[PDB]
């Protein structure tokens, strides 16, 4: 009676239990109550269009074949009782590769109350698809979804609901946010009905709204482009005669523009359209190429081969370009930074 009291109870519940059958098969849906405690929103891979999430996926349903009367109201059992009873086969619709953690013992728990209410919490690391639209890259915001539902049981057999209020059913941990470049604004849940070839299922949708931070692309791509187009714009301030001094201002700036375009394109998946960074790079490339062809136009108009401390003179094209180029680039910068920063 010291230990066999609970043993006899656990033998009484598991006797006559067909684990292949859902509770209330030909009588009622098996109401399943679900909530997610997100411990750590992991890193988001832009290249693979996927994100990683670490959860404490909780489920709760009502099996009346597990009722008991005894000295303890709630039986907290280990993982071995979970394999010997019915469990819902919930799978993630947009999941790519999710690993249930087994160190040191399968991260599961099972709590059976005396009225038949169960609670089956699993710890999962889910890699899910996040379809991205990188048209306003990098000043873009995504809504990464997480769709889960039953695989074998239709709408008439198993339905899903949130065990708390839907605003407070997906809880994100405070210190746990492994996001590097994005920023988690907030969660958003949804419950719909999907229709497939095998039948009609119940799907639960959770959207995570992410906003990309701008500091890395400003400090790595935008500001080097601004500095090199400023560097190509000081070409007009030198002497008209110094052709070998001013040809490197064309050549090296064009080479840095091309390799900056390559380095900026090599940090994002190979999409078929052009981002806002591509438009900024193209306009800056047009400016540095315009500087080079203006110098070529000056060199065509440059007579003689000496310098006056003698009528080589400063070019009027040069004098107009010194005012025309940085003002036009500032106008483009104002238009570009006012168009995309308020969307």
């Amino acid at each position, epitope marked *: 009676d010291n230990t066999t009291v609970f043993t006899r109870i656990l033998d009484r519940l598991l006797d006559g239990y067909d684990n292949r059958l859902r509770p209330g098969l030909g009588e009622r849906v098996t109401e399943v109550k679900t909530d997610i405690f997100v411990t750590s929103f992991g890193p988001v891979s832009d290249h693979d269009m996927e994100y990683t999430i670490d959860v404490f996926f909780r489920q709760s349903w009502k099996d009346e074949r597990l009722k008991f009367k005894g000295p303890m109201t709630v039986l907290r059992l280990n993982n071995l009782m979970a394999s010997k009873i019915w469990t819902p086969d919930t799978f993630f619709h947009n999941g790519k590769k999710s690993v249930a953690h087994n160190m040191t013992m399968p991260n599961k728990l099972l709590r059976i109350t005396e*009225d038949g209410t169960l609670l089956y919490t699993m710890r999962l690391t889910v890699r899910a698809e996040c379809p991205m639209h990188l048209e306003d890259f990098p000043m873009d915001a995504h809504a990464c979804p997480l769709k889960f539902g039953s695989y074998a049981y239709t709408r008439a057999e198993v339905v899903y*609901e949130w065990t708390r*209020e*839907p*605003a407070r059913s997906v809880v994100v941990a405070e210190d746990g946010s492994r996001l590097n470049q994005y920023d988690l604004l907030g969660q958003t849940v949804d*419950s719909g009905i999907v229709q497939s070839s095998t039948g009609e299922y119940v799907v639960m949708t959770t959207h995570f709204h992410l906003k990309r931070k701008i500091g890395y692309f400003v400090i790595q791509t935008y500001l080097p482009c601004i500095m090199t187009v400023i560097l190509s714009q000081v070409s007009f301030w030198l002497n008209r005669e110094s052709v070998p001094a001013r040809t490197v201002f064309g050549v090296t700036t064009v080479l840095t523009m091309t390799t900056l375009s390559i380095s900026a394109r090599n940090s994002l998946p190979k999409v078929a359209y052009a981002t806002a960074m591509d438009w900024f790079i193209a306009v800056c490339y047009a400016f540095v190429f315009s500087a080079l062809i203006e110098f070529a136009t000056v060199n065509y108009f440059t007579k003689r081969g000496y310098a006056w401390d003698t009528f080589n003179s400063v070019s009027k094209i040069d004098r107009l370009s010194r005012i025309a180029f940085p003002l036009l680039f500032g106008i483009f910068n104002l238009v570009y930074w006012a168009t995309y920063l308020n969307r």
Partner: antibody
Amino acid sequence: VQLQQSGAELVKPGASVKLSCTASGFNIKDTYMYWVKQRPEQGLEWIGRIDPANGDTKYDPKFQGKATITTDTFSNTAYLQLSSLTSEDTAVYYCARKGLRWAMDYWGQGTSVTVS
Amino acid sequence: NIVMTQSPKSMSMSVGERVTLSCKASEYVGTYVSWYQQKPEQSPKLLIYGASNRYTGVPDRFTGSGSATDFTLTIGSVQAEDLADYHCGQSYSYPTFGAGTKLEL
């Protein structure tokens, strides 16, 4: 699936009244229970929520202190208490059951409270 | 909290034509909006749940239509027993309701 309550009550202002909501055909502890207030010729407003399995209750931010909700599984009846009753507190009080997709499927017959 | 604006307030038709009742919210309450009717001296009865999911015992004329914020109940070919006070309420958070719409002849 049948919800029953008390009758109509009239009290002086500043008094206290306890009203009840009993149920049949189901156990209360599986689902939530909702209390709402229906003012005459007006809209509906939600008073509070009670979870009978956990004993967890919470209320509208306009209705703390003067409205508390208690549950009793053994009598199969959910209780609501009103304190510091005012002249504007006259309404009809409905008792609601949480149902499918949070819809308030079954509603009580309503108890009309009045002042004098 | 979450406010539920119900429009229009009071308008009356004849018998046998379509009508639409609009419901709006301050933030996202997506497919968690319940519609009820209020006969005089009667308890409220659930018409549709979710966004567009017909309850048992509800005729085919009542049809909802849902979105993130905007919701619409459509009653096509109304009758003389369909007059009530129609209430729109959300349940994405702690629940709220609207003012109610009146149907007369």
